[PDB]
Each structure stands twice: as C-alpha cells, then as structure tokens.
C-alpha cells in the first residue's frame, strides 16, 4: 500500500565535476518489486556537460530491486520516512566521485535529492574526453554493518576504443527510522542508456536489478 507495484519518482541532482557545476532534473517510473525502472534526465543548468554522462548514470534508486522472499527489503521498509545513502566511486586513474542522496515519499511518489562531487579526473582521461560507452553488468555485494546497509561494487566502464575502465564503489544506505537489517547478499545490476540527444542534455536510462544470495 505504501510501495505499490508501480511507482513514479522525481530526481534532482546538483553536482560539480572538475570544477564544472551543473543541475539535472528528471522524472522516472518503474516496478519496484520486479526491479525495473526508467527515467528521463534533463540538464537544466551547466549544459552541455564536458564529461562522460556515464559517471552520473548510477546516481539517479535501490528501492527498485527485486528481492526473493527470504531477503528482507531494507530500503522498501524504510518508507514512508525513507532513507539516505552516501557513496564514493574511485576510478583506476585517480578520478573520484562522491555522492550524498536523500530518498523520501511525497504524494505517493519517490523524491530523490542528489549532491555529487567529481574531482581528480585527468584532462585527457576517458571521462573528460567523453570516450566511455556504458557500464558492464555489475554485482553489488551488500551486507549489514553498524545499523546500516553497505554495498561494495567493482564496476567496469566500457570505452569506445574497446578497452575497460575500472571503478571501486562503496555505498552506505541508512534508513531514517530503524528497520530490520538483512543478511549479506548480492544485487545484479544492468543499467542501459536507452537514448540521448547530441550533447547529452536529455538522457534516458533503464535499469534492471535483482537480489540473490552469494
């Protein structure tokens, strides 16, 4: 009744990457118990972005994760109050992305507030040169620790040349009210850029995510 089988969400991102500030507004929808979601993202300030969109795509929603019955859904149970998450993404060439996010429920739909900081990206690296072309499928190993849910991901960005560009991701998920924590399990994630205009000011994404045990 709180989290329906179909849920819309709105997301606003304020961010800075290597000193370039920007704002992104987006609306999305999905089926939280089936682990699927889509979103249309629009750069409303600071466009066009001089860096690869792919560093922003994983920041626009883990309530849309399919869970087996034996895995309590920590983030779903956190509503209507909601939860917050914080994340650091360390790339193999020193690039760093830090994110803080607030997730709430307003008028029967999710509200996402994101703050992002990206620094130390090389001027000739694949991020500032926009030479990435999407994330490989990943597996987030999540586990409880200190009243919070944490997640570790070794993620790989595909490059237009045909190589790989690796990132280590750590995320902490904190419900605003104490809710039951699950054991350790893995979340398989597949995130697709389904469409985008010429300068990536209007971008469409599609994500499928499902939980399973290690």
């Amino acid at each position, epitope marked *: 009744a709180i989290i329906k089988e179909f849920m819309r969400f709105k997301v606003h991102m304020e961010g800075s990457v290597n000193g370039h500030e920007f704002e992104i507004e987006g609306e999305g929808e999905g089926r939280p118990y089936e682990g699927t979601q889509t979103a249309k993202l629009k750069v409303t300030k600071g466009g066009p972005l001089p860096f690869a969109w792919d560093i922003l795509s994983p920041q626009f929603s883990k309530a849309y994760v399919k869970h087996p019955a034996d895995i309590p859904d920590y983030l779903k149970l956190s509503f209507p109050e909601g939860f917050k998450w914080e994340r650091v993404m360390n790339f193999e060439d*020193g690039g760093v992305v830090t994110v803080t996010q607030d997730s709430s429920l307003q008028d029967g739909e999710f509200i996402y507030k994101v703050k992002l900081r990206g620094t130390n990206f090389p001027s000739d690296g694949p991020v500032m040169q926009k030479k990435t072309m999407g994330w490989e499928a990943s597996s987030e190993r999540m586990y409880p*620790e200190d009243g919070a849910l944490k997640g570790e991901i070794k993620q790989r960005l595909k490059l237009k040349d045909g190589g790989h560009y690796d990132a280590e991701v750590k995320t902490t998920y904190k419900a605003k009210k104490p809710v039951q924590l699950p054991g350790a399990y893995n979340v398989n994630i597949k995130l697709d850029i389904t469409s985008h205009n010429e300068d990536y000011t209007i971008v469409e994404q599609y994500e499928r995510a499902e939980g399973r045990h290690s």
Partner: nanobody
Amino acid sequence: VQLVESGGGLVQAGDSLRLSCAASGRTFENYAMGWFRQAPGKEREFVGAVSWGGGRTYYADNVKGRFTISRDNAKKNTVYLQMNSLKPEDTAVYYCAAKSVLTIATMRVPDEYNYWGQGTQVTVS
C-alpha cells in the same frame, strides 16, 4: 577487526623480506590498507597503501621500485608488504592500518585510520 602483523626480523643490506597483515573477525567489509613505518623517536611515516578492492596502490617516494603491496586473493583483509633491496634507512617499526576508503588527503595521515596492527620490527644492518 583485529590486525595481526608478522614477518619482521633482522636482515642485511640488499636482502628481501615480506611482512603480513592478517585481519580476523566477523566483519563483512573489505578494508583499504596502508603501511606505515616509525623509527624510534620519530612519528609514523607513510610507506604505502592499497585500495579495498586492490585496483589502486600508492607508494612513498623513498620505497618506489623496491616495496610492493598486494592483497591476498585467498584470505579476506590480508595484505603483504614485499620489501626488496632493503637498506639500513629502512630500519623501523612497521605498522599496517585499515580504513574504509582511501582518499588523497587521508591515506598518508596515520591519525585518519581506525584500526592498527601491533607493529613488527625490521632491522637492516
């Protein structure tokens, strides 16, 4: 998380040595690990560190090319400090420390790490 070090001792100039930093506990997290050395009287000085996943390693200037940090692919939260071409200047008490993530501003600062090992003595005659 309890850090147990081993592998120290007395060697001669040019010899090799490998230090181990074996953690133990009910922890689920993979920790980034850093190595520090402390000569008596001086403070803890940065030697190197490895990211929690093992994709990135950093080294102090005075050990580049001779020291190598690696995670154990079989034992969780276990790193090795492989020391080659040791010199008398490398004589110190070596500590391994653990933290959640490495940053540029905190990876070379001893006070930023939460967990520490007991330390092991390395003496190069």
